[PDB]
Amino acid sequence: MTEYKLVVVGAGGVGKSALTIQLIQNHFVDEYDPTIEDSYRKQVVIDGETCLLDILDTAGQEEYSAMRDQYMRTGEGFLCVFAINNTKSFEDIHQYREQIKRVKDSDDVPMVLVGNKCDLAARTVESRQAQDLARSYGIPYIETSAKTRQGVEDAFYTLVREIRQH
Amino acid sequence: KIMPEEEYSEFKELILQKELHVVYALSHVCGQDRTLLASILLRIFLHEKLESLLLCTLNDREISMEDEATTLFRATTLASTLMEQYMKATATQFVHHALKDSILKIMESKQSCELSPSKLEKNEDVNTNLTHLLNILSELVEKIFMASEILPPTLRYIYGCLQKSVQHKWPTNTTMRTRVVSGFVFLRLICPAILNPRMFNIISDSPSPIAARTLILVAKSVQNLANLVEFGAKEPYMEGVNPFIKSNKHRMIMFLDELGNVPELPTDLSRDLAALHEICVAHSDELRTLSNERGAQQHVLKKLLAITELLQQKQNQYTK
Ligand SMILES: Nc1nc2c(ncn2[C@@H]2O[C@H](COP(=O)(O)OP(=O)(O)O)[C@@H](O)[C@H]2O)c(=O)[nH]1
Ligand SMILES: [Mg+2]
Description:
The complex is a heterodimer. By secondary structure, chain A is an alpha/beta fold.
């Protein structure tokens, strides 16, 4: 039983905490609770191999961008989250991808692009163009709702694979 | 290089239009010019003593657009950026008065506040850690609440504008009067300033590992109190701070309502105006397509394009 050090990154309000809490606690709650820096641990079996998840849920407000260099150097996998109803959240993915690729100094770096809030009717972001960004990063793209439990085990569990098969 | 200040008069006049039609549009196109733009607008607006107009209105339109309320100002916008810049420019002394004492304390401490059973060392006594944390906090929060009146009038008026905006929008929702303020003064000011003291130049030393971690625990505590959230249903291991949260909620509410209650509003600019024009020229094409849409801005955005073209012409004639 090894343990993977996953880091959930992206713009404020995209649902990084909701994803972690859907995973970790298996329920949802709409609320106002912006994150500074939360950490969670959860032991789980993926593929039949029992492992332990070490999940850092981050603050994506600009004035916390000094924090990242740290969380990036120590992190093994990066879950890059945007909101399928927010195109700004989507363009902010570029900041992250490009710092991750300096601090680690690799174009290969375990990572999964996440299109959260997919339960909502107001898509401003089409799978197609997310599909493509991901394909151009050479990484998997997974749509999710933390609201519905949809794509969530998938999204964390894929990023684990990304690290193992890395 | 740039033209005399007189050359931009018609331009300036349009920018300063109350409806802020130009600024709204620019908020759409800037993209990666976002800081630079913010920087220029503020200098211009401050020069006109119209910052309030800029920030109240631009914050107001962002509240208008929101629809969903637990996402408000949670992302990056031009509005968020303006606020960040305006707050650095005018609220540093406030941050020093309220925070410096306790930040210095935390740096030069050497006892751990670690609560998470997983991070605890051999022999490390979580009972003491919690006591150290709760004390640091107790002091800090005292100093914060007692700087309620050191915050400059104009910023407070802007916070006032925020309260009135979410009023109109969500009259029946009785949480947003304080949350909207919490998001700027804690999430986007104080909590960062604790996390990264260099922010407002409180101290320029990298924290010890423990100080580093203390500032984080602290800011987590303060952001939870700021939000009015008791620990337990999220991270498990922070239960021991809820008494601090429970005994300070009413003071946090007072502090957040009071802070906005001010309803009385309390050199050459060709460099700045030139540079703003440069940005308009640059996003010339994206600006056309916004003036292809109807509504009451269209009028103004077309006058814009005129002047943008016209000014670029005048600058060519200046060119050698
Ligand atoms: N509809 C919907 N709302 C979500 C979803 N995930 C998060 N949210 C909401 O979006 C807001 C932001 O959630 P949060 O985890 O705090 O955002 P963060 O800053 O990325 O952590 C809250 O109102 C959440 O309930 C989702 O999958 N669907
Ligand atoms: Mg969060």
